[PDB]
Amino acid sequence: SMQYALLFPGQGSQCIGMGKSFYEGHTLAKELFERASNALKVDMKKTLFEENELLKESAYTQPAIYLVSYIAYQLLNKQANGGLKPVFALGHSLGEVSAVSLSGALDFEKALKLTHQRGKMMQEACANKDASMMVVLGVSEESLLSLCQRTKNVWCANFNGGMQVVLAGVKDDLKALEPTLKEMGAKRVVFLEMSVASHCPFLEPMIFKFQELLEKSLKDKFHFEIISNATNEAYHNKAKAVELLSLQLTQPVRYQDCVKSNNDRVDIFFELGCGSVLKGLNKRLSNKPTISVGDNKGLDEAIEFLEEYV
């Protein structure tokens, strides 16, 4: 009887229509949208469903992704024989918080408030810096590491595997490595859409304020362990979460190492929430399946798997 891990996506997986399918098929989904709209004091139905301008901000993206992940988890959990009992949970940047929350260390409205804040503080810390992030494709993890280290204002921010590396820094300084990246074998260089550089020193300012908010918000309750993007080591308490969700912000998201060190401990992955970004990254990282649970269709497919393989 097979065994599973949970995957929680981060920025880049938000979409117009994010949790629409959930909302209409389930009363529980409807109720959490309301609870969310009240807590954040913004209409979350409209912010997720129709073109809006606000969902573009880190401050509203981060809690929107959390929202659908949360709902995906509840719906699935309520049908799992004996509830979800994953061997571990992995997130991607903002997904890690999600994972911590659903472990039981963070109530619904507290997590929305923390996530909204994480986005706000990332935006504030980066304001008036001309900060951005830049996807590079096909250059070695080690080659970019040493390129960034010999280059002012540029850092490695994600190691997503399959030779996909996200860099962070001052726009022009990134938007100027082009001819050198090209020569190193970059097959594609896309700028992400945001004036924030996360997982690098640009976030240093916010580490203390965030730590404070973690201490005040985290309970000490974890049904399952989570894998740190920062250290690629599992954790299951408040002290460690406080420390590790802090440190994450200024350290490369090591999504590749996290999957590899852990791929042997399970037979299958559930991506909880919208999109299939982490399904995608695993194609290049593992041969184990990932059912994406963002849909009523995905919801039903996850349930069938549990009914059959336990």
66 and 203 belong to one structural domain: yes
Q: What is the resolution of this structure in A?
A: 2.5
HEC letters along the chain: CCCEEEEECCCCCCCCCCCHHHHHHCHHHHHHHHHHHHHHCCCHHHHHHCCCCCCCCHHHHHHHHHHHHHHHHHHHHHHCCCCCCCCEEEECCHHHHHHHHHHHHCCHHHHHHHHHHHHHHHHHHHCCCCEEEEEEECCCHHHHHHHHHCCCCEEEEEEEECCEEEEEEEHHHHCCCHHHHHHHCCCEEEECCCCCCCCCHHHHHHHHHHHHHHHHHCCCCCCCEEECCCCCCEECCHHHHHHHHHHHCCCCECHHHHHHCCHHHCCEEEEECCCCHHHHHHHCCCCCCEEEECCHHHHHHHHHHHHHHC
Q: How far apart are CA 65 and CA 88, in angstroms?
A: 20
Q: Which residues contact residue 27 at a Cβ distance below 8 angstroms, ignoring those fewer than 6 apart?
A: none
Does residue 150 sit in the same domain as residue 251? no
Q: Which of 178, 195, 212 is the last residue of a domain?
A: 195
In terms of residue numbers, what domain contains 21?
A: 1-125+196-310
> What's the number of domains the chain is made of?
2
Decide which of 157, 180, 195 is a domain's last residue: 195
Partnered with residue 225 across adjacent β-strands are: 88
| CATH at 158 | 3.30.70.250
- Please, which experimental method was used? X-ray
Both 152 and 133 in one domain: the answer is yes
Please state whether beta strands 88-91 and 225-227 pair in parallel, antiparallel, or not at all (unpaired).
Answer: parallel
Active site residues: 93, 199
